[PDB]
A paper describes a structure:
In this study, we present cryo-electron microscopy (cryo-EM) structures of dimerized small ribosomal subunits (30S) from [name], revealing a unique dimerization interface facilitated by a novel archaeal ribosome dimerization factor ([name]; previously known as [name]). [name] forms two homodimers upon interacting with two 30S subunits, establishing a head-to-body dimer architecture of the two 30S subunits. Positioned close to the platform of 30S subunits near the neck region, the interaction surface of [name] dimers predominantly covers the interaction with [name] of the 30S subunits. Additionally, [name] dimers directly interact with the conserved eS32 ribosomal protein situated in the intersubunit surface region of the 30S subunits, crucial for intersubunit bridge formation to initiate ribosome subunit joining. The structural architecture of the 30S dimers, along with the protein’s ability to suppress the formation of [name] 70S ribosomes, classifies the [name] protein mainly as an archaeal ribosome anti-association factor that inhibits ribosome subunit joining.
The resulting cryo-EM maps (Structures I and II) revealed a dimeric architecture comprising two small ribosomal subunits, mediated by two well-resolved homodimeric structures of the [name] protein. A 3.2 Å resolution was sufficient to unambiguously assign the protein binding sites and the conformations of [name] and 30S subunits. In this arrangement, the 30S–30S dimer is connected by two identical [name] homodimers, each composed of monomers A and B, and remains unoccupied by mRNA, tRNAs or any translation factors. The analysis of the cryo-EM data using maximum-likelihood classification revealed two distinct conformations (Structures I and II) of the [name]-mediated 30S–30S dimer. The two structures differ by a slight movement of the 30S subunits toward the central axis of the dimeric architecture, using the two [name] homodimers as anchoring points. Specifically, the 30S subunits were displaced by ∼3 Å toward the center of the dimeric structure, accompanied by a rotation of the 30S head domains by ∼4° toward the [name] homodimers. The head domains of the 30S subunits exhibited a lower local resolution in both Structures I and II, indicating a degree of flexibility. Although the relative positions of 30S subunits vary between Structures I and II, the 30S conformations within each dimer remain similar to each other. Monomers A1–2 interact with both 30S subunits simultaneously binding at the platform regions. Monomers B1–2 interact solely with one 30S subunit binding between the platform and h44 of [name].
Author numbering:
A (entry chain B2): 1 to 35
B (entry chain BY): 3 to 63
C (entry chain B3): 2 to 46, 51 to 300
D (entry chain BJ): 2 to 130
E (entry chain BO): 3 to 145
F (entry chain BR): 2 to 156
The structure:
Amino acid sequence: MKRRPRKWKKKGRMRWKWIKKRIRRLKRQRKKERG
Amino acid sequence: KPIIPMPRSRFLRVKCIDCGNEQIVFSHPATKVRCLICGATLVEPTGGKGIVKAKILEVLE
Amino acid sequence: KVVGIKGSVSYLQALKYLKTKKVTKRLKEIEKLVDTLITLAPYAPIETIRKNYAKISFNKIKTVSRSKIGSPRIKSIMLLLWNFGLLDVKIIENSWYVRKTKLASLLEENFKDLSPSEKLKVYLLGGLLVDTPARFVYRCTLNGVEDYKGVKKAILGYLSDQRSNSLIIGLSNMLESIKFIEEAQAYSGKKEYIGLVDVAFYGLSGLYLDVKRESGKLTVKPNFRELRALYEIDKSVATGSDYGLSISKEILENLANTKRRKTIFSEEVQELLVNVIKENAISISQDLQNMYGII
Amino acid sequence: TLLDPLANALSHITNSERVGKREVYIKPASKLIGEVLRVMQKYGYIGEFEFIDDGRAGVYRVQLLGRINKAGAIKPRFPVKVSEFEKWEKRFLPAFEFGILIVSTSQGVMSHKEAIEKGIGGRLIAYVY
Amino acid sequence: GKKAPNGEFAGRKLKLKRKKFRWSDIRYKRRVLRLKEKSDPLEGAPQARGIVLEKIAVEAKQPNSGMRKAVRVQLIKNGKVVTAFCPGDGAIKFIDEHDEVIIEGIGGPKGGSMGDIPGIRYKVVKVNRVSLKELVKGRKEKP
Amino acid sequence: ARMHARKRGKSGSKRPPRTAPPIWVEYTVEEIENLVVKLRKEGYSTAMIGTILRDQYGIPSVKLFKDPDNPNRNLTITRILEKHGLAPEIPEDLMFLIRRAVNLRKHLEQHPKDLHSMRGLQLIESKIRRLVKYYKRKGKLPKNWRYDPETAKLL
RNA sequence: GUGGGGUAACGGCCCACCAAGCCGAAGAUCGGUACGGGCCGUGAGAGCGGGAGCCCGGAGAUGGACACUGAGACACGGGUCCA
RNA sequence: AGUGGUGGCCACUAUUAUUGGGCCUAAAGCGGCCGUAGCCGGGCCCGUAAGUCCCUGGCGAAAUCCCACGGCUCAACCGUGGGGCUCGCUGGGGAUACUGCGGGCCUUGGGACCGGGAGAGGCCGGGGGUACCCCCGGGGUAGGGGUGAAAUCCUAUAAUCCCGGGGGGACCGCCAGUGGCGAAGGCGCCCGGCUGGAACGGGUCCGACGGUGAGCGCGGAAGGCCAGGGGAGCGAACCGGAUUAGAUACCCGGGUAGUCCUGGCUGUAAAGGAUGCGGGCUAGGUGUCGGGCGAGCUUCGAGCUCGCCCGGUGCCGUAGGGAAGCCGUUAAGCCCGCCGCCUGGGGAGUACGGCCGCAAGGCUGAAACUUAAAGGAAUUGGCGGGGGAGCACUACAAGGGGUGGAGCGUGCGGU
């Protein structure tokens, strides 16, 4: 995981922690489907 | 802060109390200055200048 | 399943440089690692294990750099040494228990003052000379095997040949490793898992073989020039079964085709290796029966 | 750690004269520093300059006349021949023939103007204007 | 600290650093790998000859309100299909179904969609080899 | 004292810019050699030898005396030890670090969980290795010579 | 490397033996891309970009392969074979 | 006699920064340290002359380019004459200032030693404190607990509560700070044992051994994981009580993993000073910490007061810098060294691939397409279930009158 602090400004966007959790969920399911 | 650094420490020409031994000693010793003959302590190495115990005769630069 | 060594797939390529005199840092690492492993494992002879075996502390194995070596690497080298019948290793809950075999402590003693490369080379050859799974793989190659399918069919036949009780356990492990890694080596290009057939092909790569990776496959090819020397050595000291695997006519004629190569080592080393196993064939063979065989 | 006495000296001079002191002491004294100090004083930028035997590396004492605007040592010792010299005057000086540069030619450290008629190349060492 | 390396014997690193960071540029990356010349439907062609398939219009971006006429063109050269804006007043009537047409990039920012209409990349110039501007002016006649 | 701590403290010391030895000294150049060899045969290193000479004998510096055996080299206590088969083959400065490293290594053997001392070791062996490399450049040490902890135990 | 072959000619170019060399982190190998240069475009210049148009050098006759004849060719308007 | 549209290239751009950019707040210093190659390196003498510089022989074709003259009206074009390149190559002579190479000399930088003094510097053993929980005995009836309210919940087989005994795990309050120490994370009960480091004073020792650091190695908060133990309190999940239109929450009552010990893995954070490290230069003021010094006080314990020097640690502040916020010797000012990173926004830290890990995850990392801004400091209003002050009848405090109940008038919503 590389990041960019500029995202953490909440103007119009979800809290970054939850987004970073959801993307992990998607990666998990995708790798599981492949293997 | 001077342009050139001078040494603050001096030397002392010292006559001993007991046996009358004449010696040259550093102003800031690190160990106990023992006379040649009687062996008694002369200067005590402290944090700063050593604590002379004999009698000074003359300072030297 | 039984051995899922992951993340060190290419760590065993370096043995091929032992075929020549090329010297690398990696080969030096292998040399010191194997020497340390052999030194650690004692030659004592479930209660026997963890009483006159040696638990291995992974984090306590360090190079001469005060730098550690990856756990999969230590696992791979230990598993290889076992595969060549040089170390008796046992797996329990989170502990590897090692012990020096009988071929070890003899190949160790007789060659105490060789080069590290010479020491390793004689170790592999001495393991190969006796009835070891490595010997079975070498016989498979002599039959023209260059794939996992060929060796699995060969061992299926041998186990079904009613004279497999001397090495049944080790060969069962071989078949197990082939299972559940066939996909990695045949059906998925990404392998990330080295089977026992793969580590078997390595080592042979350090004597007379070259290995090519093809979308998981471990395609094999020997060279007849080098194969001739140890083929002659084996027929000179025939302390090992054929396992009912004939030499192919093609490999036979191609061995006949080439000219004689150098005898790997010096002739003194050749005769020492010959006589050491000749005079102790029974003891090492029955130790191997104890190790891989049922009874 | 110290790396180059000369550039440090020239920065010392410039920074000391921005506030506008009178007597400046440079600690790391070397021969090349003196050969440098000859040149601009020959152009009247500085007053007297002299060497003081400290006992470790010597000190250089200079009086400042308040003449120099900027005096700096070009580091990467660019070797320059004669006929292309102008290409560097546009890089370090504010106007046509304003100020000088120092070159270490085969004949020693010396001003750039005097090198044009002497017809000598060499490596640029410093500049002042 | 000081921008580095400044050494007289530092040519290798001074060159390598600049070459590396020239990749951080985007236009140079766009040129040297020529991926403009791999993603292009027009294959670096300021013109192309296509066949029209159906006329469509799009809503202008807000606050601009209206109906922007255009057509869909499959390209005889290669076969890709793209939208094609039609300029002129009432020019959609002039452009008919199944027309040989000449199409060309619309000259927006970076070649993007021009002005207040999104998505589109190209505009029409000649219809059946006849310049559309005059036909907007009515000076000529479609064959 | 900034290679590791990077702290600019200056507990250093000052010497006068003296070229000639002081007039008030009475010992001749021959007596200082006798005194230093007497101290050294007792088993004193050149640093502590010098401290004693300046402390009780009151001599500012041997370096202020010019070598009778060489007109262009200042006399040094180390050179005097060399003049009479007393100079050490391993220079004192590195020998002290060797013994410190060995004893600390014993402490770490007895205390595996002290990582601060581990780092102290990690830096003082870098000091030893740096000076070994320097001496290899200068040649005072044999080219093949390489510190090894097991050999260091012997030393 | 030794000793030989064929070449107009030296050369592993080729052959028998002998030995383990050679290259690579300063970028080998592999892949992408591409005839090199005099030059040309732009720019105050440092520089960036390009190499078709005239001259020199390199190479090719649909892809491939091969001889003869000739001082000179594997030969655009000479020859032979596969597709 | 051109003129427009479009596409490719250079400039515009110092948006590729050698000349010549930034990285505290706008994209941009990796959490920290060590260290190889490489790069950059103290002063003086002697030698060499490779680089470096001046002179000179051979050589870089023609064509193009600059200029004078001449010919075609002139021009373009052509010739006569002079000049220029990538001219990178090569023969020889001359110089020794700097770099390089060799030899010698010298300590300021760095490293090394010694004396007292300071510090939550680390590891190991022993002792011990307070509080808390459980258990036993005595007393005590009639509740306790908790909230905005209650409820769940414990309790009469004696609860809460008080006293007297037993066990247990965790942690070591105030002193405590703008204090100290540590490379950073981080480090506090007392004693003892081992161990690292710094500062101060003395160069007393080596003689440039140095700085940086691609590759490399190391240890490194909480949480999670593997194996065994342990589990007083707290408490992810979960289970109930409540609240609400809706409660998966905030609130309350319980409660597993966790939190603790031993071995190992994971390599993570707004690991922030959002400031990579070494040297030198540049007004000052102002307190404490350590060491040293000079005085005075001193019941003579650095015990106490004032000045000075060194190191670290704040604030204010001259000039200076910056878009400003602000920084301003502990620099975000001026020079000298080296590595990393940054090149509109989003996609995206994603896809694919590689490497590591037991797993979760880690280290690397695009493109298509889309958009005119994103973004930063800062001024004026508006607003706050923000604060402070002042007021107040189209407001309330106390008091009085009265509508909405019935009908009617007056005009209105709606038919």
